[PDB]
């Protein structure tokens, strides 16, 4: 009867960076350089992939994104392919994306191992990879006719991706430092 | 009564602002251009350093301590390989080798004044202000006698004086 709405989520103060999931506001810690290393370098594998092949446009948090009135998450790394361009609004993205990468982190790695697994299904993001430094994997799940199912789970080699075509990572090369 | 770095970390979870000469800010949160800005940015600096094993790039948010009271949120950073040892577990404690600030309308003054004036003192060697209003770049060479404007340009390609080899062509920042 108290849920929270996207509303409420727009006059948190200045300089917040919170979710709502559910109806329910969670601020979000600050993340550790390990898991900005992780989102750069993934970051440019994909955008690279994207931008050879023209297939649209790659973000990174902080960008929120509105799912429905109880729901605006702001996803680690997105791709919104060129046919759904419009969802890229002034100040946000209003929709799901087609593609979707969380990062995890270690005291809070809940709602992306499960409260947006859901959403993310439920809006029809066609791909969910879930990268996780601790443990140094990735999970991915591809949508259907039944919700995610998972495409692949490793900790090494390489894993590839089933709607970007052609596009393969190698799992590993995301962890390393100098 | 000035603020510090151990004030800055008391502030409570979910929170970003910024230490700057002892006084806490807070920073508005990003629009879908400048997160692209610094997409594109990024993905052109990390493809450089990658393929010249030079050290290792982040972008915001993460945590840059300066001094007691200095703790700033750059957009984009490179650490070299010699200055390695900043990179904490939690933060990056000193100052980066290497620094860009994607401007936001709101609230440029501390990326074109405050921030310029820190990052100079705290021996930055290249700072690159990247203007997606008026579509332009600035590149600061620090030295001797502090920064010098090494290019400003809203078209053709900019040198890094620094990263030797690398260059960027300035409108591929920018959206049409
Ligand atoms: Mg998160
Ligand atoms: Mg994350
Ligand atoms: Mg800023
Ligand atoms: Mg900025």
Redesign the pocket.
Known sequence: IDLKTDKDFAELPEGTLA?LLDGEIFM?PAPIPEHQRVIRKFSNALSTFVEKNKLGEVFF?PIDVYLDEHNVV???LIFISKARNTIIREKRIEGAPDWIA??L?EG?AY??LKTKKRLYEKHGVAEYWIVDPMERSVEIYQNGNSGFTLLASADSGTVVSKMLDGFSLEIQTLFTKP
Request: hydrophobic share 15%; glycine share 0%.
């Open positions: 979710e979000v948090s702001q996803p680690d969380e990062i982190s809070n709602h992306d």
